[PDB]
Amino acid sequence: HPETLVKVKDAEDQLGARVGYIELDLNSGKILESFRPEERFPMMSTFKVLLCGAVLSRIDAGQEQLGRRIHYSQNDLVEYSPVTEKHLTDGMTVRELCSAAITMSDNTAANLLLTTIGGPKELTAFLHNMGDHVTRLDRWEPELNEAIPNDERDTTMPVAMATTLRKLLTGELLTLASRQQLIDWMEADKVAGPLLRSALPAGWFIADKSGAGERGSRGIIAALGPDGKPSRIVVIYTTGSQATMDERNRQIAEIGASLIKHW
Numbered sequence: 114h115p116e117t118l119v120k121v122k123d124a125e126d127q128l129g130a131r132v133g134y135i136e137l138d139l140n141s142g143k144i145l146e147s148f149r150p151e152e153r154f155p156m157m158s159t160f161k162v163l164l165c166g167a168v169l170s171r172i173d174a175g176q177e178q179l180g181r182r183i184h185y186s187q188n189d190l191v192e193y194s195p196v197t198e199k200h201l202t203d204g205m206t207v208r209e210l211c212s213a214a215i216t217m218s219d220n221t222a223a224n225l226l227l228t229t230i231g232g233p234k235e236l237t238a239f240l241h242n243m244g245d246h247v248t249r250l251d252r253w254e255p256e257l258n259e260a261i262p263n264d265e266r267d268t269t270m271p272v273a274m275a276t277t278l279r280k281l282l283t284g285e286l287l288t289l290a291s292r293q294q295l296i297d298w299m300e301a302d303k304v305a306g307p308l309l310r311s312a313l314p315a316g317w318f319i320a321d322k323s324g325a326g327e328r329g330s331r332g333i334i335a336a337l338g339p340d341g342k343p344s345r346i347v348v349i350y351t352t353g354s355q356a357t358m359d360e361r362n363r364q365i366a367e368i369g370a371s372l373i374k375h376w
């Protein structure tokens with residue numbers, strides 16, 4: 114609805130930065146609403162959903178197993194790794210790593226998983242092969258959250274991320290079991306409370322993944338809908354603001370509120 118666009122533009126004035134927005138119909142793939150759909154924004158942690166999408170693909174092809182245990186040392190530990198710091202002695206299974214990367218945004222878990230699939234270059238090739246010729250991962254954690262102005266590294270476009278998310282969750286790329294596993298991890302996300310979740314009515318379904326980086330970068334991707342069933346995909350990104358975390362969180366939640374109101 115155009116009223117939501119008013120809110121997106123209002124967010125731009127408040128944050129004094131660009132805000133990319135896309136609202137997509139999960140079933141047909143129709144773009145319902147868009148704002149700066151083809152401009153680039155740094156993905157930040159939102160790429161982790163794509164990463165685990167690629168990991169599940171390999172699991173479907175029998176090249177990987179969810180139960181395989183991966184051992185690492187404290188030399189592998191990077192900034193912000195709540196789950197991996199604690200499982201240093203035991204190591205973690207591929208399944209536990211993806212859960213950690215998506216639900217807790219564990220940075221080391223992302224890096225470990227990146228190594229198993231061939232790194233940034235392979236994730237990018239994976240995306241290209243499924244029809245996404247725009248989204249690209251170039252670096253590892255935490256450098257990929259740098260968000261240098263005009264840098265095309267580690268970026269996506271709102272429309273690309275939206276359509277790619279749709280393919281992973283409802284397309285024939287992954288098996289039913291894997292598509293369900295990916296959406297389950299997203300539904301269990303524990304660090305996206307101030308965002309879309311704070312403006313969601315009771316009983317609604319939501320599977321999301323947020324991101325935060327340098328230079329006021331913030332973002333979130335989500336599949337949501339009433340009656341416990343997802344029916345739309347929303348992607349929101351912003352970068353360049355001097356605003357605090359709370360202020361950026363507030364704007365995204367307000368966009369979510371408008372999105373719900375005019376559903």
Ligand SMILES: *P(=O)(O)CNC(=O)OCc1ccccc1
Pocket residue numbers: 157158159192193218220255258323324325326327328
């Ligand atoms: P994800 O939750 O987006 C991983 N993000 C990340 O590592 O952010 C670190 C950061 C944020 C802000 C300034 C400097 C570094």
